Point group: C4
Chain length 95, copies 4
């Protein structure tokens, strides 16, 4: 379950690195903005302060969303159930 | 389970084709933009770089979201559990 | 299960009517735009072509999201599992 | 189950207070706007009427989304199943 978490964590980082490199290069974003946009996209927040302007970028974004959402949300779920929840429970019981 | 996936895949493509034809025609979008907007809508990202301007388009969008989200997210789930997950597990074991 | 669906359907309509009346009145939207915005909000798409400008509207929106998401998505789930899925299965078997 | 709800409720309030203080201070938003933006972010609506402009804000937002979504949506789920659903059922049976 901690190895579950480690693998999803690594996969999430790799997925976000892919987006960061793509949007920096093809859409011309600063790397921090490309990382931020990748996160805002795959968590489905979608502010629209950044959005792709090239056709190559729009096509990549379609594919990135379909591949990336299941991973990101799997990580979020394991984070909440396997890390946040036990730490909250631990806080209720003084030692 | 691979036939589960094939059917959801076909249904997702058909749903995205419907949106592409509608928004190209009624909202005047280029086809690639109409496909991109359909994806951004049904995955609930919603950048707002494109949004419907006609009343016909707003009404269609209401109905398209309610019909389209359950399908799209069903496909994403099967993609992640039935295709991505086994391929990740396979990568852990050299042959 | 069809009464499950009927109740969620009615509750969803009532929730969308509430939003339509509120945003028309307080935020000055045309009724069709207020309905569209309510749907775009509770399904978490969030284009931002419309957004509340008054403090009363922002406060209402906070509460409307928290009360409305669980209902809307419950309806979507029952729609997909209890109506769309059987009709798809029925299409596979000629009579 | 009512203590389940109380704990998630308190945690959600604390998470929203954190965002309110951060975005007011670092991004210069009025407190009501910072609360509204925090809610719009963690429920994944993402209108984009407000979005972070500083790099410190973008980095905080990445981390806030990953930590905050699992909590917020856990609260929404318990709200819908443990509070809204029983009250709806109660309304069906006159006393
Ligand atoms: K969104
Ligand atoms: K969303
Ligand atoms: K969601
Ligand atoms: K926007
Ligand atoms: K959005
Ligand atoms: K937006």
């Amino acid at each position: 379950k901690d190895k579950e978490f480690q693998v999803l964590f690594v996969l999430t980082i790799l997925t976000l690195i892919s987006g960061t490199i793509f949007y920096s290069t093809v859409e011309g974003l600063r790397p921090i903005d490309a990382l931020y946009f990748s996160v805002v996209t795959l968590t489905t927040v979608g502010y629209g302060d950044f959005s792709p302007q090239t056709d190559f970028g729009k096509i990549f974004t379609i594919l990135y969303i379909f591949i990336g959402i299941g991973l990101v949300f799997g990580f979020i779920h394991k984070l909440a159930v396997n890390v946040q929840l036990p730490s909250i429970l631990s806080n209720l019981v003084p030692r």
